Design a binder for this molecule. Structure first.
Ligand SMILES: C[C@@H]1O[C@@H](O)[C@@H](O)[C@H](O)[C@@H]1O
Ligand SMILES: C[C@@H]1O[C@@H](O)[C@@H](O)[C@H](O)[C@@H]1O
Lengths: 309, 309
């Protein structure tokens, strides 16, 4: 009784960041999810500040890789032997699904591989793409592969970084049928079982749906599905981690307030395991004031009935 | 008296992010600064949460640009007519030096320009470089130029984004003599005066130097100077903005604690206007435990004498 008061930050949606790719939030979206399994590994955190899945604290690290590269002779492809984010040796023994910040969806992520030669400080950067559905995508084992636009420029045994930019669609896939944001990679490679996963989430209360914090990933080629939905803004992960306020019930009731009118636009349930639901049936792009923000009002139970969104 | 207690977050250096480029912090550095003018515009915030210069809240937006592009015929160069970060019209009337997150140093920043065609969702991405020392670099006026590897692929009148990756050195400049991290761009173009700047900072107390929060920018070509020093971690900007705790004096005394020993490694002054000094003379790479963190201990005056670092 009387535990440290819980709260959410006073930040607008546009002031916040996707927790699944290093891009700002744009909008709120709700829709049915019974046709897929919603089990992202980034953007996972309890309200009392326990990080889950592959979630870490800074959004700039999400979908980045570091290590050194080995040329696949006769190609423009390179295997990256992963390092830790601080350039130390990779330690695969942590009880996590994959290094923190590893991509948590199947898709073709395009970005840039950069490298510095230690002896002289010479540098180089080239377009690179990682296919996280590849049989050889095995970040938990410390290896991933990049397709690049060079077969000779990258040196072995030198620090190399991948900075993500966006996603592509190619290879005869159907328009907007990739990336597949709700398909988890096999983190140890094809036909291995993922471990230490944050659980799947779903609305369980009749008439409820998940509320998604949505961005549009940049597209780099083809006709990709650029929608990217996270369960928590990165800033909420950061805030809960720092506050570590105890949950007094299973559900924190939040009101989304419009400062231009002083009135509540909608209310929602922030589940203590770290996801949000609203009372709505159907796909809906929420129309919000850009200065709107969420406000924690009370601890309720999972069987509280929300006002329709 | 009795004002809301000030604090800094319990985050390690490696858990934090540079406030001047979207990359993690790596280390702490101190050195003399009397030979340059230290006046960065990103990573500027008072301890009571007032954002300064071009500082905004999410690190992923730093050094990004959005808008639409106009091809310079007979070249592979494009002028970007800037939009707001949320894709609304750019409003140059705000009393800021340039759009929030604009680069605050002179250098050649390489990244990727991406574009989506609205009608069909077709996408494209190409290597692009902005030279923030260019006479035509005029983000405050809503204009910047990109050199790319195409003269035909980018459409006019479509949403286009620049995602930064790193820096280059070329054009016969001396090795490691660019970027110039302490040279501010002319935000309205060559021979215009910058406005609404966060002030220059310097140590004033004898025997003190600035403490810098340092990263290494990726290099994309040539022999760039990749050192990037910020005055405050991005997470401290975020935290002070959210806490808005009043400063009880000009200086917050912080101790850097080593949890592996329980002892203080060094102490430093966090000035209320948002920068840090230490008692040291000379260039020094601080050797810190990776789990070390800063802790606010007391309000002191600017005339307090620190223990030597
Ligand atoms: C769908 C197509 O994808 C890539 O080939 C782009 O280079 C084209 O401009 C177009 O967007
Ligand atoms: C200094 C040089 O810079 C660019 O030309 C790179 O492509 C080279 O590999 C080398 O790093």
């Amino acid at each position: 009784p009387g535990s440290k008061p819980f709260s959410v930050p006073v930040l607008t949606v546009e002031e916040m960041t996707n927790s699944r790719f290093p891009i700002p939030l744009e909008k709120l979206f709700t829709g049915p999810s019974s046709a897929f399994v919603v089990q992202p590994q980034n953007g996972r955190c309890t309200t009392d500040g326990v990080l889950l899945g592959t979630t870490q604290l800074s959004p700039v690290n999400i979908c980045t890789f570091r290590g050194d590269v080995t040329h696949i002779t006769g190609s423009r492809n390179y295997t990256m032997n992963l390092a830790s984010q601080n350039w130390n040796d990779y330690d695969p023994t942590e009880e996590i699904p994959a290094p923190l910040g590893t991509p948590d969806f199947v898709g073709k992520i395009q970005g840039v591989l950069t490298q510095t030669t230690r002896t002289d400080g010479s540098t180089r950067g080239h377009k690179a793409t990682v296919y996280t559905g590849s049989a050889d995508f095995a970040p938990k084992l410390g290896r991933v592969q990049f397709e690049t636009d060079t077969d000779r420029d990258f040196e072995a045994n030198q620090n190399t970084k991948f900075t993500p930019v966006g996603v592509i669609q190619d290879g005869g896939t159907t328009h907007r049928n990739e990336p597949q944001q709700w398909v988890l990679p096999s983190y140890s490679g094809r036909n291995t079982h993922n471990v230490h996963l944050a659980p799947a989430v779903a609305p369980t209360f009749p008439g409820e749906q998940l509320l998604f914090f949505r961005s549009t990933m940049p597209g780099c080629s083809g006709y990709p599905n650029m929608d990217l939905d996270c369960l928590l803004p990165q800033e909420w992960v950061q805030y809960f981690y720092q506050e570590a306020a105890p949950a007094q019930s299973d559900v924190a009731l939040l009101r989304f307030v419009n400062p231009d009118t002083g009135r509540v636009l909608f209310e929602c349930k922030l589940h203590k395991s770290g996801y949000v639901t609203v009372a709505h049936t159907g796909q809906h792009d929420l129309v919000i004031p850009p200065n709107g923000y969420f406000r924690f009002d009370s601890w309720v139970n999972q069987f509280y009935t929300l006002a329709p969104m």
